[PDB]
Amino acid sequence: DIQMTQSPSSLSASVGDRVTITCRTSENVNNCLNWYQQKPGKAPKLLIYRTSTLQRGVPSRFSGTGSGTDYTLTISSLQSEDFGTYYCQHYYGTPLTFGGGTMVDIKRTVAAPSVFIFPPSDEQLKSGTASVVCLLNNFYPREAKVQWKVDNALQSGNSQESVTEQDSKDSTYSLSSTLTLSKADYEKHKVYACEVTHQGLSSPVTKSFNRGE
Amino acid sequence: DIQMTQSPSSLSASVGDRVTITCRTSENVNNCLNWYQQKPGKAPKLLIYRTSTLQRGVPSRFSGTGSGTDYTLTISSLQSEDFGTYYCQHYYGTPLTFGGGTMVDIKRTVAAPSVFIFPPSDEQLKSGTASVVCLLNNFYPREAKVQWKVDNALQSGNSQESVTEQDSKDSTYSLSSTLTLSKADYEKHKVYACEVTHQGLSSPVTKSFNRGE
């Protein structure tokens, strides 16, 4: 029942920077500490075990040090493919415990999202369902909010979002929001709008279309 | 390990007839034999246990006898609600084994099925799915075969069937066969037919319709 605190909780640096992540345990874990890198949608990948031993196939720029209640993961030269959430984990007794995680990505200047809205196609409308797609293209940082409005009414519970991983070239993100309705519900409304808020925008951006126009 | 043979496999008698079902075992079962009644779509119901003892709530017209390898289930006066499949089961050691089962229903003259076909409704076609229904109404005996032909092509794996229990009045059965397609697959074909084979029909009967007519 050993508590584990990671610092920082979020981190952003440039390619080639030196990155240090600290893992503090409430009690001495006697070097029984492991480090993992998790990319979105994937299982955590083991980087370091037993404080300092690199796993097979892990690049040498990852190193681990520490003892007692103080442990450190170090990336000597940060690379583009090093984004994700890093976890420490102790195995000194039970229960096995993970740290809260530390999110890492490549730092760049703020880029506002470019917003596009797509009406459902006639082919899908024949199928009895209607999907309205809203695209937020090439923005940074990751934090973004998308709201759907059908005839100026805020929607809830009928949309899903998907985000791409941080691009290796421009270090931006892309996001798609899909509003799913039945054809009957889609046909009894006129205006379909997508409102986007992002710190790169001085004010929310709305893209809308009128059904059948 | 211990094999069990029931005789007969299928049985049809009139109301008030005396029905005798034989359960033969390959080895001595030592009177550790039970009898079950199973209605269609339901779990087996224990009728008699330990060769001869009736379960509470079982009418006295059911009786079980036998010893060694020969056992008998007797219905002194068959009633209409006695339809179903009857199983014997031994528990003299393991593995526990059941008999093959004996189907019982009320005897009557052969009745040919009245076949109807129903196209999918407009309300369902708007929803994006198409269900075509073929009805076999008031037939006897139970054995019947239904085949779906879409543009004269035999269909497989896209239909389900449901049967009513034997009617208390006329002792007939009714069956529905539902062919489920997507709206797209349904719209790319013209002729939809169900072909029915039954002993009451001198030749197979085909009911069909042309989509959009």
Residue numbers in the entry:
A (entry chain L): 1 to 213
B (entry chain B): 1 to 100, 100A, 100B, 100C, 100D, 100E, 100F, 100G, ...
What did the original publication write about this model?
We also solved crystal structures of fully glycosylated BG505 SOSIP with 21N13, and of unliganded 21N13 Fab.
Accordingly, we generated the E275K substitution and the resulting trimer, BG505 SOSIP.v4.1 GT1.1, referred to as GT1.1, was expressed successfully in mammalian cells.
